[PDB]
Structure formats: C-alpha cells, structure tokens
Amino acid sequence: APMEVAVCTDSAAPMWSCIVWELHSGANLLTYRGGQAGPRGLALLNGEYLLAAQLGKNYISAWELQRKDQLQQKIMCPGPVTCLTASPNGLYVLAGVAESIHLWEVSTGNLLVILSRHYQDVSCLQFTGDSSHFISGGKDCLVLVWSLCSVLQADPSRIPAPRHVWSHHALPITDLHCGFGGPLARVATSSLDQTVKLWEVSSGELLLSVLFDVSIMAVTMDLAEHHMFCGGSEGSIFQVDLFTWPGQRERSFHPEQDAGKVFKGHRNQVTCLSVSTDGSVLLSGSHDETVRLWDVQSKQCIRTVALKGPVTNAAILLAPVSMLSSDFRPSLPLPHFNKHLLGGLTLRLGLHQQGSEPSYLDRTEQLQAVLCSTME
Amino acid sequence: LSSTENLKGFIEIIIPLLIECWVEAVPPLQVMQQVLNIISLLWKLSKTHKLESWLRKNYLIDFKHHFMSRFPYHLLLNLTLSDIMVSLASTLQKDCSWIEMIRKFVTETLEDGSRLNSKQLNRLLGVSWRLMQIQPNREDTETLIKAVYTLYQQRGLILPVRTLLLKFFSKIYQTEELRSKVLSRWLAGLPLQLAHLGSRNPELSTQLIDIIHTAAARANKELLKSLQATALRIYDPQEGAVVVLPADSQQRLVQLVYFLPSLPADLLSRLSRCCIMGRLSSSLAAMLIGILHMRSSFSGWKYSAKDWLMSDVDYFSFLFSTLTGFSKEELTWLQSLRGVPHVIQTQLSPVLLYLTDLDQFLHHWDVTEAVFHSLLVIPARSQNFDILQSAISKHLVGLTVIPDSTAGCVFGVICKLLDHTCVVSETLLPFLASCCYSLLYFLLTIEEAEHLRKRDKLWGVCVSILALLPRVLRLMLQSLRVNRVGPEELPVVGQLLRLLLQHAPLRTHMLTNAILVQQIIKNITTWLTDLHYCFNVYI
C-alpha cells in the first residue's frame, strides 16, 4: 500500500516551520527549522529539495528533504517574492516577484526569461500537470495562460505574450487548480467576487460560473473532476457536484442545494484545500490556527490538528522514496541560482534505459546459439 | 451575385469599365462620386483573404493614381475614396505616401467636424480606427487621438455622436491589455461625468462604471486621483451614484471600493450611512462589509501605506456606527419627541423603547450578521470588547430612548463576544438592566398586526443575554419595586415573573435570589393564582 503525507506550515513558526505528519496516524515524519513560510510559497523540487519563500522578505530558502537545518543557498530576487512553484518534472523553478514572473532552470542554474504583463502583484502560480503550460494570476483580476514552449525559445527581442488572457473577474484572484493533462486540461480560477469559474486550457472558453455567498479563497478539484471544493471567507467549505450538472452555465449555490453539501466547523477563512488520491479525505487549512481532515463522503470531521498562528500552506502528497528512506543523499546539488538575466547542461547520463536489461530467456538463447555455432 | 463566383465573375467585368468612366468624368458633379459609391458597395458585399489580396495585387496600379479624386475640391466625396483606399496587412513601408496624406485628410476632417451627420461620421471613425490599426506606431497615432479628443471636447455635441465616440474610445482602451498622455487625460474626466449623471442615462452610466472599473484594475494613476477626489460625491446616502441607480450598476460601484486608494473618516462615515438605511439592499450590504474587511488592517496582508488606511480607530468607529446604525441628527430628533402611541413607556425602567417598522428592523437584523462575523475574527478579544464598552458608555448609556433594533443588536454583540477573559464594567450594568426590562415589557404587551413577527428573535436575544450574565438579572429583579408602579402594570409584572419562572435555562442564576421573588409576590397582593403555585417548577 502507498503512503500519504500532509505537509503543513504555520505563519508564526515558534519552533518548527514545515511539519510533515502521516495522514491516517497523525504521527510526525519530518520537521524543518528556519524562517517563516509564505502564502502559496512552498514547492518540492524534483522530490529532493523543499524550497520555500519568505514572509515579507525577498529571498527563497532551500531545505534538503532529509535535513532539519537550512542550507546555505538562498535564491535572491530584486523585490518581494509573492508566490513560488516548481515544475512537476523538476526541470524548471518558477517564482513571482512583484509583477514579474522570473523563470529559472534547475539544470544549469540560469535565469532564462523575466516575463512581465500583469499590471499589479502576482498572487497565484500553478503548473499544468504535464509541465507544458503554467497559469499565472494576480491582484489585477487577470488570469493568463502562458506556454512553456513559446516563452523559452523566444527571441530576446520578441517580448513573449500569453496564449490566453482570461479577464472575467472583477476582484483579485486567490487560488487556481490546473488538473492533469496538458493541452486538454481545465483550470478552476477563483476570485474575491464570490465566484468560482472553470475554464478550458485548449480553446480558452468559460464553462461554469458558480456564484457563492461569501468570497472564495481556495479551490481544489478531484483528480477525475467530480467535485469542486470551494472554500469560503467565513469558514464553510462549499462543495459543487460537476457530474449531476443541472444543465446551465451560470449557476447559483442556494438553488444548487445546501446544508447537505457544505462542510462546517471552521471559524475563519480557509486559505488551503487539497483532496487525497482516492478522494475520500480532504485536508483544509485556515486562519483560525487549525488544520483538520474531512470525510467528503459523509461531511464529517476526523481530526483537528492545531498549529500556531494562521496556516499558510497545506497539501496532501504521495510520499516519495525520499521521506521513507533515512539517508537519500540527493542525486545532484542545487546550482547557483542567478539573479541577472543570463550550452552547458549538467545532467547524469544513462537514465533513458533504466531497466532495459536482457531477460533470462534472452541470455539463455544467446548462449545456446553460441554453443550451436561453436559446435558446427 | 449570391454565389461567391457570381460576385467574383462580376468583379472583373464592371470595375475596368468604371475606370473608363473615371477618365471620362474629368480629363456635372455626381459622375465620379456614384462610381465611388458602387465600388464600396461591392467591397462591402465581399465581407476572403485570397480574393482581397487578388483585388489588391490586380488593381493597385489603377487605384494608386487613376482612382485619385480632388481632395480640396459635403466631404463624402473624399470620405468614400479614403474608406476604399484604406480598405485595400504589412505593406505600410511601400504605401506610406498615401497613408500619410490620407491621415492628413482624416485629421483635417476630424478637426473641423461639427455639422457632420451620424452615418458618415461613423464611417470616418471606422476609417480612423483602421488607419491606426494598420499603423501600430504610437507617434503616428498620437495626433489622431488628439484630434478625436478635441472632437470629443467640442462645445456641445448630440447624444448619438457622444455615445459613438465613447464606444470607439472604450474600443481604444479595452485593448491596451492586448499610457498615452492624451488618452489618459480623457480618462480622468470620467468620474466627474459619472457623478454628474445621476439617473438621466443609466446605460451611459453603466458604460462609464465598466470603463472606470477596467482602468482602475490597472492602477492608472491619472484616474485613481480623480476617483479619490470625487469619492465623497459619488458615494452619498441621500443622493448620489450608489442608491439612485438600478440594482445592477450598484454592484460594480460597491465592488469598486476595493480599488479605492484611501478611505478617510469622512468617506467611511458617509459609506456606513449608505449601508445602514434601507436605500441599499441587504444582499449588497454583506459585500460592502466583506470588502471593507479585506481592505482592513486585520485581513492578513501588508501593502502600501496610503492604502490599507483602516487605521484601527476609524474601522472601529465604522463598525460601531453600523452596529447601532442611526444618525446623530435623527436620533436626537427621536429623543426630542415624547408621547406617541408608538413608544413603550415604563415607570420602573428609566429607558423607553421607540418602535420601528418591520422592514427597517428586518434590514437592521440582516445587516448585523456581517458585523458580528467581522468583529468575531478580531484577535485579542479583550481589547475590542473594551473598545465596544467605551463606545457604548459614550454614545448609548446617556440616551433616554433607544430603538427596538439597537436594543437587540447590542445585546447580540455582547452575548456573542463574551468569553472567559471578558469583564463587564460597573457603570454599564444599570443601562443593560433597564433596557432588558423594557424589552421584556414590550414582548409581553403586543396588542398591531405588524409588530408580532419581531417577537421570537427578541425573546431569544433577551433569554440569551439574561442567561449569560447573572448580574443584569439581579439588577432587574432588585429594580422591581411595586409601590410606585400603579395597578395598570400590576398584571404585566406577574406575567413576566411567570414566564421567567417557566423557562429552564434561567433557573440556576434565578434560585440564588429567591427572597426577592416572594417579596414582590406579597406586595402584588397588597392570573395571580398561577404565579403562587409556579415557584416550585418540576420538583
């Protein structure tokens, strides 16, 4: 059976700063010691390094996964870092500085491009589940869909432009959720105007405009797109059913049922949501200093782990080999992350054939052929 | 000409013949102009890339020189020629000569266009838009933008022309996402126009609020200054631009409060007065409080000093003045009146209760939930409770007559913000006791057909405040003298005692003071039969 962890961070950090505890046991696995984290500012890099932003300050820390102490490498930026996100494959680390979308490369360590189209701060940054598109949104009520192909191989005198410009909200964005896929995925942007819209990343069209009662501050979706758990600004965790589908494009929550589709038990905002793999336990942070697991099938609480201070980042992962093992020295050291705009790839060969070794019957047949040829 | 080929087959047939007529025209005055008309007619009849490129590459030679007309030579003659010439991608470098002189012509007609009718003016506007689109260099478009703005600023224009110009400009602003001084100077004059246009043209005001919202979404610093300057006028309770417009355009204009740079005491007060009264719907009263909370100092974010200007004291003043929402002038006038068949009078509690219509009470009870939630999130509950107690002891205890809405809302705040560390002052208890007794008398004596639905809420609030604090119950029981109370109020006090006896939660705090229960009972004798037996309750 697999193992599921729940990474949690607090905005006060008296003793620890990123506690990793087992889901169905509640016991700690790994802790970390250092500066305070930042909202939407945690991202595991290649399953080896736990990069984290800093609250207010302008730089990014870096913890090796099997090490309780901060490393001596600090990514530095020319302005207050707002959000961070590492690409799923692990090749690119992409962060947002004020209104810029600084993009790095893990292999060489260079700073490829500095994209800049938002008119105000950038407050959410997500990567499509195949690292082909990355969606960025900010406090200017704009959600843009970039493309990792066009923004990388663009001429230095071409000023790359976003593939899609989604401008339907009337208030700052707060969270996004790009599902699996690629050029066929679906985004679930949510703003402060009490709406949660589900877009399409292939053609760029609206599909749903659920309008809630309180401002939405976090949206997560089931991996098969069956439920859309939208957080609230008062504590409730509303739930939309995408497979019932009453059959319109601009719904409203109260006509879409109530009191049987609302998780309740929180007393302040919920700026964190994540659904487990199978889709039976939901982990939600808050601002009332509590991270609690729900029971999506029965809308009941399970445990009420209480942190210190507001909860910034909280998510459910599938525990890699890193956390299970005890030493796991990283394959490659983290390079020197540049802060100025610009061959030489640094990589380990012999990984495109891992396991492509001859089978027992193949070797036996080759040996028998050699014997027969020698006999003649 | 319905088929594409039938129209195309007609194309090569006629136009060479009108060129023959074009030479015969000039080596009357209609001749050439009618030839100009039918070409555009069929060009429009086209609306494609291959066919338009075919016409371009096949008739460039003729159109360059033979199709020229008398520019100096009331202006449609040259206007149609300019339209078709512009209607003929990336060929600006090979055509800059006639592009430049056509730009000069369109600027010349734009500058002095005052008596021009709507149709050819729209055609000229489209021609100018296509001219700036085909030449996307800022320096060349600056002069055209200046000319069209000077047309926009002429001393008196008809409404359709103004609407068309505003639509074109909108379609010149709502594309920047795809900072000219002349473009941004017209933007600054939009909030003043919106403030002046109260209710005459709702559609124009909707367009204005849409463009203002779009521009403020990009922090255009030449607009936010004027918006902050006119925020006082545009947000006004009595008359303004938040309460007089329909329910649709008053949602964007309350969501716009987020982008407002600074919120001083004046704007905050006249915005609280906008949301307390019945002018604004209760649905759009939680949105405003949520926005003001998200722009407050306890949201969780930190940004520029000028914004986030909810400097604690002003935020608490706004929250209190919307919790006990009633203006000072109307409250003082209400205090002035004395003696109506609308106000409950009591000789035992020196506080009277002014009665309110059902709609006002329902609105004030549906708007106070947001205040409850906003005042519940505040960290360090003791400090905000102390601030609330100071506000109550400064603005409410000295009052003689209090409304039936505040008497419930303040009790709700007190019973919702109470915890272990909270401590109630000693100069506040008598006011609470008097208000509680007057409220109970009001609930007991309810004899129009409207003031009956506001009973369960008030009874729940009263029982909750009675249960949470026992000192107010003790004070009310102590201040239950019957010697001064006349025979008119003899049965009501007994009914109140019976009802208090019946209810279960008010038992532990009640049986402690048992002597005062009998002391009033014997004085009552000097309906009563039930009270005497009811001392021992299910025991």
mmCIF file of N, CA and C in Angstrom, chain A residues 117 119-121 139-142 165 167 170-172 192-194 217 233-234 268-269 287, chain B residues 176-178 213 217-219 252 255 258-259 287 291 293-294 299-301 303 373 376-377:
data_model
loop_
_atom_site.group_PDB
_atom_site.id
_atom_site.type_symbol
_atom_site.label_atom_id
_atom_site.label_comp_id
_atom_site.label_asym_id
_atom_site.label_seq_id
_atom_site.Cartn_x
_atom_site.Cartn_y
_atom_site.Cartn_z
ATOM 1 N N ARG A 117 3.625 40.908 -17.602
ATOM 2 C CA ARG A 117 2.430 41.516 -18.240
ATOM 3 C C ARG A 117 1.416 41.915 -17.169
ATOM 4 N N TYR A 119 -0.468 43.917 -14.300
ATOM 5 C CA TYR A 119 -0.396 45.371 -14.000
ATOM 6 C C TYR A 119 -0.212 45.566 -12.507
ATOM 7 N N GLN A 120 -0.459 44.534 -11.702
ATOM 8 C CA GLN A 120 -0.210 44.590 -10.239
ATOM 9 C C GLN A 120 0.383 43.255 -9.748
ATOM 10 N N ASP A 121 0.430 42.985 -8.456
ATOM 11 C CA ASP A 121 1.116 41.841 -7.878
ATOM 12 C C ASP A 121 0.561 40.530 -8.431
ATOM 13 N N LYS A 139 -3.393 40.222 -8.591
ATOM 14 C CA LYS A 139 -4.333 41.150 -7.978
ATOM 15 C C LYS A 139 -4.888 42.171 -8.959
ATOM 16 N N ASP A 140 -4.705 41.968 -10.262
ATOM 17 C CA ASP A 140 -5.290 42.832 -11.275
ATOM 18 C C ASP A 140 -6.503 42.195 -11.941
ATOM 19 N N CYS A 141 -7.080 41.166 -11.316
ATOM 20 C CA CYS A 141 -8.260 40.471 -11.829
ATOM 21 C C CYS A 141 -7.997 39.827 -13.186
ATOM 22 N N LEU A 142 -6.753 39.432 -13.442
ATOM 23 C CA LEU A 142 -6.362 38.814 -14.699
ATOM 24 C C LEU A 142 -5.769 37.440 -14.436
ATOM 25 N N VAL A 165 -5.783 35.307 -22.451
ATOM 26 C CA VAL A 165 -5.985 36.366 -21.466
ATOM 27 C C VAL A 165 -7.404 36.214 -20.937
ATOM 28 N N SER A 167 -10.047 37.449 -18.603
ATOM 29 C CA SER A 167 -10.439 38.607 -17.798
ATOM 30 C C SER A 167 -11.960 38.622 -17.687
ATOM 31 N N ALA A 170 -13.961 40.485 -11.348
ATOM 32 C CA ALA A 170 -13.970 41.903 -11.016
ATOM 33 C C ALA A 170 -13.222 42.200 -9.725
ATOM 34 N N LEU A 171 -12.455 41.246 -9.211
ATOM 35 C CA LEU A 171 -11.747 41.385 -7.948
ATOM 36 C C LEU A 171 -10.537 40.463 -7.984
ATOM 37 N N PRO A 172 -9.555 40.676 -7.106
ATOM 38 C CA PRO A 172 -8.306 39.909 -7.199
ATOM 39 C C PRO A 172 -8.522 38.405 -7.102
ATOM 40 N N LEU A 192 -12.264 37.032 -5.560
ATOM 41 C CA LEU A 192 -12.877 37.581 -4.359
ATOM 42 C C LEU A 192 -14.317 38.023 -4.567
ATOM 43 N N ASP A 193 -14.808 37.964 -5.809
ATOM 44 C CA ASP A 193 -16.170 38.490 -6.113
ATOM 45 C C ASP A 193 -17.241 37.442 -5.825
ATOM 46 N N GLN A 194 -16.900 36.358 -5.141
ATOM 47 C CA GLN A 194 -17.849 35.309 -4.773
ATOM 48 C C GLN A 194 -18.196 34.413 -5.961
ATOM 49 N N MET A 217 -11.714 31.784 -1.243
ATOM 50 C CA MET A 217 -10.288 31.966 -1.022
ATOM 51 C C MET A 217 -9.453 30.727 -1.316
ATOM 52 N N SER A 233 -14.853 32.616 2.950
ATOM 53 C CA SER A 233 -14.257 33.651 3.779
ATOM 54 C C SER A 233 -14.832 33.678 5.185
ATOM 55 N N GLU A 234 -15.745 32.762 5.506
ATOM 56 C CA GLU A 234 -16.330 32.676 6.832
ATOM 57 C C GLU A 234 -16.033 31.369 7.545
ATOM 58 N N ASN A 268 -13.001 30.898 10.648
ATOM 59 C CA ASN A 268 -12.388 31.989 9.902
ATOM 60 C C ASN A 268 -12.117 31.499 8.483
ATOM 61 N N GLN A 269 -11.335 32.269 7.730
ATOM 62 C CA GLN A 269 -11.081 31.943 6.334
ATOM 63 C C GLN A 269 -10.401 30.582 6.211
ATOM 64 N N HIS A 287 -7.344 30.229 8.873
ATOM 65 C CA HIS A 287 -6.727 31.329 9.595
ATOM 66 C C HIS A 287 -7.000 31.268 11.089
ATOM 67 N N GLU B 176 -5.697 47.846 -24.504
ATOM 68 C CA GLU B 176 -4.318 48.068 -24.005
ATOM 69 C C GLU B 176 -3.788 46.744 -23.449
ATOM 70 N N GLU B 177 -4.653 45.925 -22.835
ATOM 71 C CA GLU B 177 -4.232 44.588 -22.322
ATOM 72 C C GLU B 177 -3.799 43.741 -23.520
ATOM 73 N N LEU B 178 -4.140 44.162 -24.748
ATOM 74 C CA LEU B 178 -3.681 43.449 -25.967
ATOM 75 C C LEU B 178 -2.552 44.259 -26.631
ATOM 76 N N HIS B 213 -13.977 50.821 -13.879
ATOM 77 C CA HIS B 213 -13.515 49.610 -13.211
ATOM 78 C C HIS B 213 -12.347 48.981 -13.957
ATOM 79 N N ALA B 217 -8.559 48.677 -12.495
ATOM 80 C CA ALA B 217 -7.932 47.369 -12.363
ATOM 81 C C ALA B 217 -6.472 47.371 -12.793
ATOM 82 N N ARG B 218 -6.021 48.408 -13.499
ATOM 83 C CA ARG B 218 -4.644 48.513 -13.961
ATOM 84 C C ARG B 218 -3.866 49.606 -13.241
ATOM 85 N N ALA B 219 -4.440 50.191 -12.188
ATOM 86 C CA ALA B 219 -3.768 51.210 -11.378
ATOM 87 C C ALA B 219 -3.304 52.394 -12.223
ATOM 88 N N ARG B 252 -21.297 46.878 -9.144
ATOM 89 C CA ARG B 252 -19.949 47.214 -9.572
ATOM 90 C C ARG B 252 -19.440 48.422 -8.796
ATOM 91 N N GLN B 255 -18.405 47.087 -5.402
ATOM 92 C CA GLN B 255 -17.188 46.302 -5.551
ATOM 93 C C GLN B 255 -15.974 47.160 -5.887
ATOM 94 N N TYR B 258 -12.842 48.333 -3.261
ATOM 95 C CA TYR B 258 -11.566 47.662 -3.022
ATOM 96 C C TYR B 258 -10.406 48.429 -3.645
ATOM 97 N N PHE B 259 -10.593 48.950 -4.855
ATOM 98 C CA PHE B 259 -9.520 49.627 -5.571
ATOM 99 C C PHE B 259 -9.349 51.085 -5.164
ATOM 100 N N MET B 287 -21.609 42.329 1.138
ATOM 101 C CA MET B 287 -20.494 42.506 0.213
ATOM 102 C C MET B 287 -19.647 43.710 0.599
ATOM 103 N N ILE B 291 -15.733 43.623 1.729
ATOM 104 C CA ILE B 291 -14.693 44.401 1.062
ATOM 105 C C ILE B 291 -13.953 45.276 2.066
ATOM 106 N N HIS B 293 -13.578 44.730 5.192
ATOM 107 C CA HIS B 293 -12.735 43.845 5.985
ATOM 108 C C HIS B 293 -11.479 43.420 5.241
ATOM 109 N N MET B 294 -11.599 43.076 3.961
ATOM 110 C CA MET B 294 -10.453 42.707 3.145
ATOM 111 C C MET B 294 -9.500 43.871 2.926
ATOM 112 N N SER B 299 -6.770 41.730 7.856
ATOM 113 C CA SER B 299 -7.007 40.719 6.831
ATOM 114 C C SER B 299 -5.896 39.677 6.824
ATOM 115 N N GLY B 300 -4.646 40.127 6.872
ATOM 116 C CA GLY B 300 -3.518 39.218 6.880
ATOM 117 C C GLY B 300 -2.428 39.588 5.893
ATOM 118 N N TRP B 301 -2.660 40.631 5.103
ATOM 119 C CA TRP B 301 -1.706 41.099 4.106
ATOM 120 C C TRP B 301 -1.170 42.471 4.508
ATOM 121 N N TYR B 303 0.653 45.999 2.560
ATOM 122 C CA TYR B 303 0.937 46.662 1.290
ATOM 123 C C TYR B 303 1.181 48.141 1.573
ATOM 124 N N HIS B 373 -19.768 38.775 12.401
ATOM 125 C CA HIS B 373 -18.658 37.981 11.889
ATOM 126 C C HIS B 373 -17.373 38.799 11.816
ATOM 127 N N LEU B 376 -15.972 39.246 15.208
ATOM 128 C CA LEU B 376 -15.594 37.986 15.838
ATOM 129 C C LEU B 376 -14.199 37.518 15.449
ATOM 130 N N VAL B 377 -13.731 37.861 14.246
ATOM 131 C CA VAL B 377 -12.401 37.466 13.795
ATOM 132 C C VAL B 377 -11.288 38.247 14.477
#
